[PDB]
């Protein structure tokens, strides 16, 4: 709505 | 003016009986496919099966050249993973010789509802008797 | 007559509108080539 959370820590494809 | 087209209802379809004894499988089934599809009719129209029903007799007695008799393999996959079941020519003739011709003609007929409606008009029979005498198939020498 | 005065031919060259379709010639980078610097908002090297 007005707030958006950060997404999950994405795949550590290092 | 528009070119003629054979109508599905108005067309007439003759019958024909053919004696597969000693005929080469190819040069038999090829002419069979021509007839079934209707090329032999001047009333041809490529979206309607104007061919004449064909009855194959002595389907066991069909012959192939060379060493095809024991080397021409017929494969089919059974849907399941490992099952690519094969069967050579001799095993096919011994099991059910109809399938030899039926395959040689499904291969040459169109692919699609018209093809599977043309192959409905082929009435191959293993031995020499056929009960379709009520339709009076004319003899055909091919 | 007021609704009869018409300018001589060739006077008004009829402008040139960039980015108003495919039929008009220009449009989709409006006569300034593909990506680069000379095709940016305000880009273009000094004199």
């Amino acid at each position: 709505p007005v707030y958006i959370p950060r997404p999950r820590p994405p795949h550590p494809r290092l | 003016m528009k070119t003629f087209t054979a109508k599905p209802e108005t067309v007439k379809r003759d019958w024909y009986v053919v004696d597969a004894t000693g005929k080469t499988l190819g040069r038999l089934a090829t002419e069979l496919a021509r007839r079934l599809r209707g090329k032999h009719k001047a009333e041809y129209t490529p979206h309607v099966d104007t061919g004449d029903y064909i009855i194959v007799l002595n389907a066991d007695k069909v012959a192939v050249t060379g060493n095809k008799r024991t080397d021409k393999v017929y494969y089919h996959h059974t849907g399941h993973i490992g099952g690519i079941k094969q069967a050579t020519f001799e095993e096919m003739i011994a099991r059910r010789p109809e399938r030899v011709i039926e395959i040689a003609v499904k291969g040459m007929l169109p692919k699609g509802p018209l093809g599977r409606a043309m192959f409905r008009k082929l009435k191959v029979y293993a031995g020499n008797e056929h009960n379709h005498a009520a339709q009076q198939p004319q003899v055909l020498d091919i | 007559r007021l609704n009869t005065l018409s300018p001589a031919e060739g006077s008004k060259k009829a402008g040139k509108r960039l980015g108003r379709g495919i039929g008009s010639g220009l449009g989709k980078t409006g006569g300034r080539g593909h990506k680069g610097q000379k095709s940016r908002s305000g880009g273009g090297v000094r004199r």
């Binding site: - | 070119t3 003629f4 090329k39 001047a42 041809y44 129209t45 490529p46 | -």
Partner: protein, 117 residues
């Protein structure tokens, strides 16, 4: 000098949908997708106006081949006998004869045979 572009866009989207009448699904209800279908239909029309001139020659030839093998001469030798006798009938008329008037086409075949004789 604001211009509320609410009538041109409407009567243009509608002009496309009217051409798209008869298409399955949203392909005939949505302008963003009927537009592709209509340009694709235009490609198909512009290409089939030639595929048709092909198909009908390759249908007339098939019919002539039928009615020529009927009378004992392949299509090749038939056309060859015709051209030799300098008969300029075209494949459309040939096919339509071969379908409607059988004795006329038989006379044609006989002339071609004689020319090849």
């Amino acid at each position: 000098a604001r211009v509320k572009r609410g009538v041109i866009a409407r009567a243009r989207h509608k002009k496309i949908l009217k051409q798209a009448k008869g298409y399955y699904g949203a392909r005939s209800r949505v302008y963003r997708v009927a537009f592709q279908a209509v340009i694709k239909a235009g490609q198909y029309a512009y290409r089939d106006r030639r595929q048709r001139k092909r198909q009908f020659r390759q249908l007339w030839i098939a019919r002539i081949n039928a009615a020529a093998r009927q009378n004992g001469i392949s299509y090749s030798k038939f056309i060859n006998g015709l051209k030799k006798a300098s008969v300029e009938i075209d494949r459309k008329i040939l096919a339509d004869i071969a379908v409607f008037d059988k004795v006329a086409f038989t006379a044609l075949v006989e002339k071609a045979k004689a020319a090849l004789a």
